[PDB]
Design a protein around this nucleic acid. Sequence first.
DNA 1: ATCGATGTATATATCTGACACGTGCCTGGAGACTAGGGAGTAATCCCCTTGGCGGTTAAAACGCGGGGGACAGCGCGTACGTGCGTTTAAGCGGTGCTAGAGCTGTCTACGACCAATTGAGCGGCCTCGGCACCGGGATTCTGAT
DNA 2: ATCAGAATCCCGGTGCCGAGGCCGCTCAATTGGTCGTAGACAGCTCTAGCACCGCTTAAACGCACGTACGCGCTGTCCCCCGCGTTTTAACCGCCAAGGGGATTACTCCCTAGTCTCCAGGCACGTGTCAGATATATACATCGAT
Lengths: 97, 97, 93, 95, 105, 103, 83, 78
Amino acid sequence: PHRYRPGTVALREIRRYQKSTELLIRKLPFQRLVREIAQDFKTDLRFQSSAVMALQEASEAYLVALFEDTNLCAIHAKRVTIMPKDIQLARRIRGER
Amino acid sequence: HRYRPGTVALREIRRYQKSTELLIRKLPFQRLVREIAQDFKTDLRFQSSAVMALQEASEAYLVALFEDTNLCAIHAKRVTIMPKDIQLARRIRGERA
Amino acid sequence: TRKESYAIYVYKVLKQVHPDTGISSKAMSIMNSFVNDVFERIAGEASRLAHYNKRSTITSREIQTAVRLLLPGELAKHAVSEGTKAVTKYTSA
Amino acid sequence: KTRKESYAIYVYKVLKQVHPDTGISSKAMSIMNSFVNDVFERIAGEASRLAHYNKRSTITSREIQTAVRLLLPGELAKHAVSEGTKAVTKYTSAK
Amino acid sequence: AKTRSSRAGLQFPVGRVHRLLRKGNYAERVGAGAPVYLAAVLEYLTAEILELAGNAARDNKKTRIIPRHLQLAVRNDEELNKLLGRVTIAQGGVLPNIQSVLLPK
Amino acid sequence: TRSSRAGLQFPVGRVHRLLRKGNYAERVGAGAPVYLAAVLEYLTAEILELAGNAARDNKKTRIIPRHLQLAVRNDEELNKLLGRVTIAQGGVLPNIQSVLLPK
Amino acid sequence: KVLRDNIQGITKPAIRRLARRGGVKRISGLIYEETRGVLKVFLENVIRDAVTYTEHAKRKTVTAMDVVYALKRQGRTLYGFGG
Amino acid sequence: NIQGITKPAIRRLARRGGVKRISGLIYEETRGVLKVFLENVIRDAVTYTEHAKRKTVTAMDVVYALKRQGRTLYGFGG
DNA sequence: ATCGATGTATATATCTGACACGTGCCTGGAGACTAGGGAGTAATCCCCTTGGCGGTTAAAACGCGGGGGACAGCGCGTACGTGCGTTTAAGCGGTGCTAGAGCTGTCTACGACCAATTGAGCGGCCTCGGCACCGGGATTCTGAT
DNA sequence: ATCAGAATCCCGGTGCCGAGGCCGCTCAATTGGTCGTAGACAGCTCTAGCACCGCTTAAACGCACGTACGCGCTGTCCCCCGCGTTTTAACCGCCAAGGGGATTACTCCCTAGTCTCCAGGCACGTGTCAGATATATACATCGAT
Ligand SMILES: [Cl-]
Ligand SMILES: [Cl-]
Ligand SMILES: [Mn+2]
Ligand SMILES: [Mn+2]
Ligand SMILES: [Mn+2]
Ligand SMILES: [Mn+2]
Ligand SMILES: [Mn+2]
Ligand SMILES: [Mn+2]
C-alpha cells in the first residue's frame, strides 16, 4: 500500500486550516464547558446562543494566536516541536498569569 | 589576583537590583531626547521633570526588556543574550511586527 | 423596535467604491463594530484632551489631534486632510 | 502662587492609622498621589461604561461597586467592597 | 440641502455623530465642526477598508464581502493591521504563513 | 463633613466634585463618592501597610519609592493591579536566574 | 443536571486543528493538557467578567453583549457580535 | 549623539535586568530599540504640547503619552 | 575542605537639607431649600432558551509500527569578562538673562435648551441569484520499486 | 531514473435562503430664536529654563590576555506521526414548555441647581532630625593551593 512520510500531512493540514475560517473546536463540547465554568461562578445562568458563539470565537482566535507565538518559541530553541515550556515562555512574555 | 570570568557579573547583578539609581547618565540622555524631539517640532523647551519622567520610563522599560530577553537566551540553552532574543521578546510582546 | 446601525452609510460608501459588490450579514455586522470602535477611540481621546487642558468642549481641533494620536501615519494624514476638508466645506454651505 | 490640590494629607492620616510611628518622603508622596488618581479614573471610567451599557444616567454606589469587582483581584476586591458597603451604611446612619 | 451631511458633502450622518457625542459624556459641550470632522474620518476609514476588502473579495472570485475578506484586507495592510492590532474579527481566520524551518529541503 | 459621617479619612466632598466635573455621567448618586472614597482609602491603606512593613524590614522610619515597589511587586494581588505601572525610583526585586549561579 | 470534567470535551484533534491554523507542525504530547489548562484560565476570565455585567444588569441570561464587553475590558476586542 | 548611550550604561541596565553575559551586537540593538521607544513616546508627548499651544513640553504631556502607550508612570503628577 | 584575600557589610561619629509641623487666609465644601425627571416597580406579551428524542455519520478513540527529532556528548575557535593604566566629558556649584507660561478682566461668538415640523431611516414583507452542496473528472507529486 | 494512487484542484449542475429592494410608517433631526457663559484675546507678571563658564574626579575608554561559551557535528534513543479499525457522541431538524427579557405604564424620590455662610486644605513659614556620608572594623566570601 501507501504511506505519507512524517510531517507531510501536518504541512497539508496547516494549509487546510489556514485557508478556512470555520471553528475548530466542536460546538457542543464547547458549550458544556462554558456552562460548567459559569455555573461555578453563579448558578442558574442562561446563555444567548450567540453569546456562547462569541466566547468561542474569542477563545480560538486566542489559542491560534497562542500557538503562533508558542511555535516561534520552539523555533527559537532550534526545535520544531512545540512543548509546554514553549507555551510557558510565551505567556510569561505576553505578561499573562 | 584574578576573578573567574562571570563572577563580578553575578556581583554587579546583586548590586544594581539592590539600588534604585538611574544608570544612563543624565546629559547624554538629555541630549538624545532633545535631538529626537527637534525632529518632530522646532524651538522647544523641556521641563527638567519632563526629562526625568522620560528617563525613568525608558530605563524601567529596557530593564523589563532585558529580563524578558534574558529568558529567551535561557530558553535556547544559552547564557549570553543576543539581538535575536530581543527580537523574539518584542515580537511576542507585540511591540515589533 | 428600532436598532440603529451604520448599515446604510456603509452600503452607500461600498457602492461608491466597488459598485457591483455586496456585503454579507456578518461582514456588515463586523463593519458596524469597526465604526463604533474607532468612534469611541477617537471620542474618548478627544475627551481626555479637553480635560487635560481644563476645557469644557470638544471641537474639531480636539477631534483632529485625537486623530493624530490614535492613527498610524498615512492613515492619520489622509484622515486629517479628509476631515478638515469637510469642516471647511460645511462652514461655507 | 497657584493652589494645586492633592491627596497628600489624607494619605498621611491613613499612614498614621496603619503605621503610627512612621513617615514618608516627597518622592514617594507623589507616587501615592499618582496611585490614587490612577485608581480613581479606572473605577470611575468602568462605572461610566456600566451606566451607558445599561441605558441609564446615574453613577451610584452600585455602579461604583461592580466597577471595583471588575477592576480588582479576587481578594483585594473582596475587602474593598466590604469597606465600601460599610462606609456607605455608616454614612447613611448620620444625616 | 437640509442634511448637514450634504453641507459637509458626506455620506455619514453628521446628525447621528452629533447626538452620540452628546449622549456620551465626553464633555459638557460639543463644537459644531467636531461631528463633521469625526463623521468624515469615520467615512475615510470605512472607505479605506471596503476598498481592500472588495479587492480581497475579487481575487477570491466573489460578489459579496464576507469577513475573511475583511480579515485578509486588515492584516495585509501594515497600517490598518496596527490600528486593529488588538481586534478579533469573527470568522476572520488567519493569514497563510508557514515558517521556513518547517518546510522540506 | 462627610468623611466623619462615614468614618473615612478621605475627602468625601472632593470625590463628589471630581465625579461630576470629570464627565463620567449626567448625574451622580450620594452613596458613590462615599463608596469610592472608601475604596480609595482601603487601598491606600493596604499599600501604606506593606510599604511601611518594608521600611521597617529595610530599617528606615521613612518610606521612599523603593519601599512602595518592594511592597507592590512582592504582593501577588497588588502587583497584578499595578501590572502596567512603572513606579519612579523603584528599582527591581532581586532575582538571579538559577543557571546563571556558579556551580 | 450535574456537570463534571467538561474540559476533556476539548479533544486532542481539535487542540491540534487550532495549532495548525497556528502554523505548528510538530506537537509534543504534554501540550494537550497545558492547552486545556490555558483555555480554562482564559474562559474563567471572560466569564467572570461577562457574568459580572450580567449580575449588574440584574439578569439570569448572559447576552452576546456581556461577553463582548468583557473581551474589550481585557483588551481582546471582538467584532462580529454587536458593540 | 545616540551612540552617546554608552556601552557601560547599557551593561548596567542589563545587570539590573538580571542579564549575565552580553554579545557585542546587543549594544547597537539596544539603541535602535531605545530610539523607537522615545520617538513614539515623544511623538505622542509633543502632540499634547502642540495642542496645548506651548513651546515647552511638560511632564504631564510625557505622563499622558506613557498612559496612551500603556506604560503608565507614577510620581510626576499623576 | 583550608588557605589567605578580597571586596562587602555593620558601625558609630558628625553634618545638613527636606521634613514635618504651625500661621492664617481663602475658596471649595456644606447646609437650606426648590424642581422634576430618571428609574423604580408592578403589570403584560411574546421571544428564544432549554429540554428531550432518534436518524445519521463524521469525528473521536485506540493501537501499531518506525522515521526522523529531541537531546546528550563533544570538540574547536573566539567572542566576551576581567583588569590594569590612558582619555574624556559628566557633574557641581555660580551667576546671568529672558522667553514663555501663568494669571486677570472683558465681550461676544457659539452652543444648550427649547417647540413645532417632517422625510431619513427603520422594520416588515417579498423574491431570485449568489453561492453552498453533490458528485464527477483531470492535474500533481509523493513515495514505492 | 519510471509508476501508481491520493489528495487537491477544479467542473458542471443543482437546490436553497439570504441580501437587497420596495413600501409604508414614525421618531430623531431640522429649523429658528433666546439666552448665557466659555473661550479668545489682549494686557501684565515673574518663574522656570536655558547658557555659558571651569575643578576636581568619576566614569568612559582602550587594549591585553586567556577562558568558557557558542556553535556545528555526531550518534542514540525514543516519541509522536500516520493509518486502519473500533467506538462514541456531534450534528441535524423534530417538537414541546415556560422563564425571562423587553416593552409598557404611573408616582415620587434623589439629585442638579441656586444661594449664603463657614472651615478644611493650601502656600509658606522655620528649626530639627532622619538619614546621606564615611572611615575603620567585622565578616563572609572567592580562588589558589
Ligand atoms: Cl467645532
Ligand atoms: Cl448613590
Ligand atoms: Mn460545578
Ligand atoms: Mn570542597
Ligand atoms: Mn423611564
Ligand atoms: Mn516674553
Ligand atoms: Mn530517483
Ligand atoms: Mn414569567
